[PDB]
């Protein structure tokens, strides 16, 4: 149960999805000189690329074929089969099935290169148009595209930048890892939002649940019954600690590779 | 899909025929010879590989088609096995039918590395190769194959793999003429709407790619779609030309400023022609 | 044989791993987002952070599978993917319907990024399956239970992906003025001491040395007076005297050098996570 | 070559050439503290080192065994050493009784130290094999008679051991101006000419340039009158004119960079 | 070849007895124990290795002498085999053994395929000497690594040695009986009076005297020879005197203050 | 015999002094004498021919092999080399000398360790008796702490004085009819800093210089040689060894003597 709830807020890569993916599979007449079928979702950590790959196949009522890359690093014997079951499960019912890859980096002493990967890199020249078939589609994610490779990276035509999330998105977060830890008026969720400038969406869960944890502690070596009502100085002494994640310099070399790589 | 030019760029355009097409329409006039590798050097997108698509039909030659990527990579220590059997088969397909073939090389760039492991992955498969070209010259007359080689890096290019190409054309960034065929060919089937007025869009595209055309309206068209889907409706909205100006605010060119004086530079100093 | 009681480390150490580990055990339900079952205890050499994990277990009247990386990395061949699933599986098995939680806890949690033979075995092969195995404890189909505590004194080694599945990290911190009195007496234990000694000024006096090189210089001081004996052919022992403390704490200086304690401290700030 | 050809480079190139081999196959009697058989010809490409190792061979009326450096490391996957002794071997005993001098020339002998697979076959197996040949080549007092000239572009990649069996290095030299003259005839022998053209001041317009791209500038000078027949649809091709070479030789430059010419250069003054 | 002040060096001796000889007479009274490892650590020539020797031979014990540069180049198999023999030498008959190490420098480094050239073989070797300590009991078998380059040895390895003896730079009483042990057989003539020579050598390790006197007995024979005896001649002052001019102290000035400075920060005791 | 390289004595009786006299006399030897023993110097002064001249000093086998030759197996070959040379030290105490020229060439898991080891092993060996280890090399850089330590014995082959150079000028001007003016002694002090090698070019080059006259010339009989030949010559040729090598050299010697 993951449908376009859904991340949180997040509109523009989220259209930008549809557009790559949705709409050729509601309407593939529309578009004559085709569409890419290999999907890059790259981007800081923890803004969890891989639960947004979720909700697209989630609204195609599609089947979900979810691999890391690190764990299938002979090892062709299954990269054949994740694609071969992924057209099969696309029956005669054009349901589009959906691979998504996490840590795609991690595909890149013989058979470690190329073997493994040149297999792959094929498959998803297969994808294409042989014989019309159809339907099934790649979604890469990656926190690191550095490592990706000039090959690699030009068979997934379709790139986006999923970016760090900004102080509208933070809010219906701190809401959403609110949603069930009894909070205390005085918090007032806006002016944290705007304090958590720069804190990727993992780090936030971090924040909240560390900040509650603050006052379980309470409760036991107070030696309370129930714990204690959540504070917003709870917040401002767990925000000294905790920084942001994603240091000032990756998210320099994120832009640079973005700009040269769109 | 013939030298009809895929769009007028008649410069390049010329300077392909008088390297390939005259030789192959009348040797004997050509006593010092003439070069039998050839290549497209620019920046990416201007689709150097319909260019060359377009030189063999004109010449209802064949067409071998390889992308460097692959005979590096795919295969093993022994893609040498390959890359003799591409020029093999592109001779022996010059048969006593004197129909010249076109051996076209994409991202020639990647014969000089991609190796990974074992060794070097140079020399070994990349001198086989470049000694293939030298033996193109006039080995027991044969003659005919040509080699076609395509690149966006010509850094990479190395100072002996350059000298079996002696022929460089540099595929420039398509003009406002250039364009205006293209956004034609692009439109092809997109209900356009009056009120669009192409001739101004070219001129609007200054600085762009082909490909980056292609792009434009792909994404001006799925503007419209993106309306149909919710409202509901079959066919989409009638595409506006205000949808080109949203469009064309956000998408800028694909061709950095810099790479621009980059490959100008190399341009002028490693290629006279 | 050892609990939680403890002696000092309350203000920082031992809470913090109660914090993590106790806590979620006794009362899960007061954890709605969960709670990391990765846990890296980080710090100079020597402060026995084996046997801090070992009084977590025995805290929770828990099963503690002790295992040196090491042993796992050299010891076996190329499967010794054969042992690290079963290091988990039985962890998780002793996990019974009995909800008593297992700990598993590794010893010089560096030496699964090295040690190898079959470049390519060595890496991944080994290291993935653990790595994955990790990622397994959080919530598969409850059973829950089950916890990995590492160890290292090298944590420069630890890996950013190997680190992301270690949430929870205590530094374990040189021992403080009220750590060392408790040691300085464990260690006088069992040699007969002469008053004039006064352990307090000494662990006042030891600022800086590990606990390790504790046990050290009461040894030394120790044979400090058994040398006379021989030498001097004394029937038993002097008294050991607090002169001996003196002279030996002017040669013996802290095993932790000052640079590695910058090095700590840094890696400690960025790469903080509470 | 019929005298050795007159091709022009006498101060330099030519006679050094002579030096190293032509004597001590006339007369080696005049050397008593021996003559070396190792000899290097390094300079920029094109000025077709291949050539002129070919004129010597036909001075002395002697064998040219001819061997690419790239093809001998390729082909034979580890054992190329197979070739690399009979390359020798053919040459001593086709330096028969009939003291009739053989040449082997090398192309491309930069490619010796690289272009491999497995680690301990590509260096050494094959190299110190070659290596060992050339110490051999100096005397054992069991046939003298045979010589080795190496051909580079590139001898920055020349190694030190490597470099020390070839004790003659001649600099083969950008060609002079009255070197390109005779190039300039030989290269316009069959393009109907048309007078206006004067060689003369060509040759002297193409300074700088290697030989190899003197036929370049020749040949797209006679492709520029073609090109106009053509779109022209003319019957013959036009009379070569000299506004031809005029704007050919504005676009066309020299093939050899100005700082491969300080590279050069600099290797010549510390490796003579 | 004992000890006994089989050399004449004190400081160095009483320091090893104090770490090893002891606890071998008297383990009881040692309560807290004491460290099996053992380290030798100076200027190169003092010769390390005759030291190591002569505690072996004071307990009438086995002494497993292995260099760490074929124990790396020409390895598990007998990195735990060197242990377990030792062990096992060390019968009912508690007579402890002793493992020495030449060159420990070289157990960090060779190698040829990276990674069964670190850890592998050192983490296997490391772990051996954690076992020393006291699994059940058994007991008595001993370490002791030698080494001119403390430099090299890491912070680990350094851990598992926690007695730690500066074997020093010889002085002035010391060379002495070096002099003497080194003329031992070489007809000397009087005129020589070794202790001029003893304050002469300030600066020289014990490697560089047995040169000095070698090469002074060496110019003799050439004598012989060069003048047509059948024994020599010979035997001088002022063959030292000019034997000394051109042969200067093996160990220099700034590996001096390096040894000095890797010394104070820190050995332990 | 030892007529021999030409004129080198402090190098020559530090060559003695290791392996002439424990030959004639071991009995004066004690503590022993190191059977391992290193030539390292620039190159060109021909080490070679000085390890030749111990040899037949004591009427012995010169058993010569080049590192680079002898670099599947190859370990068949190594101790075979020690082998012959044991056995060819007889009953008869005749001691053999093994010479390695290019030592440097010594030093993937077949090529280092078990080709090595297996030779260094054999030096630790020599320590029967009789047989010698001469080794050469003009990269010391290369040669390794522990290779190093099975060579005791190291004498630098210095780039040749004043006086050697000489009797080699003497040596090379053997037969190329000289003409007087060209008193060789001035020649001697003008090649300061000259390798032997890169004198016998000199010469060489010098005569290659009269030969070219009467071939261009046209001359029955070369010209006599001359004395402005070798000052032309002179400028154009330069010590082979560079001024960086000499202090690397130089360096090296001072840390391993």
């Not at 990276?153 to 930048?161: A, D, M, P, S």
């Not at 999923?162 to 005085?186: G, Q, W």
């Not at 304090?195 to 036991?220: N, P, W």
Request: net charge neutral; with cysteine.
């Amino acid at each position: 149960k993951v449908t376009l709830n859904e991340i949180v807020g997040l509109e523009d890569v989220k259209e930008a999805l549809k557009e790559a993916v949705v709409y050729p599979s509601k309407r593939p007449d529309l578009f004559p000189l085709g569409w890419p079928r290999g999907i890059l979702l790259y981007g800081p950590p923890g803004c969890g690329k891989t639960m947004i790959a979720a909700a697209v196949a989630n609204e195609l009522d599609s089947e979900f074929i979810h691999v890391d890359a690190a764990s299938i690093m002979e090892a062709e014997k299954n990269v054949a089969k994740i694609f071969k079951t992924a057209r099969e499960l696309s029956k005669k019912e054009n349901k589009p099935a959906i691979i998504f890859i996490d840590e795609l980096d991690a595909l890149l002493e013989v058979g470690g290169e190329a073997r493994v990967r040149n297999q792959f890199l094929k498959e998803m020249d297969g994808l294409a148009d042989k014989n019309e078939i159809s339907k099934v589609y790649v979604i890469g994610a990656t926190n690191k595209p550095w490592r990706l490779d000039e090959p690699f990276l030009r068979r997934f035509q379709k790139r986006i930048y999923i970016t760090l999330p900004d102080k509208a998105h933070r809010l219906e977060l701190l809401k959403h890892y609110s949603s069930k830890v009894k909070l205390d008026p005085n918090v007032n969720l806006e002016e944290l939002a705007e304090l958590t400038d720069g804190y990727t969406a993992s780090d936030i869960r971090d924040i909240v649940q560390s900040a509650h944890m603050r006052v379980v502690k309470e409760m036991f070596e107070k030696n309370l019954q129930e714990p204690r009502a959540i504070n917003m100085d709870d917040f401002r002494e767990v925000l000294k600690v905790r920084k942001p994640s994603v240091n000032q310099d990756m998210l320099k070399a994120y832009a640079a590779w973005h700009e040269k790589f769109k």
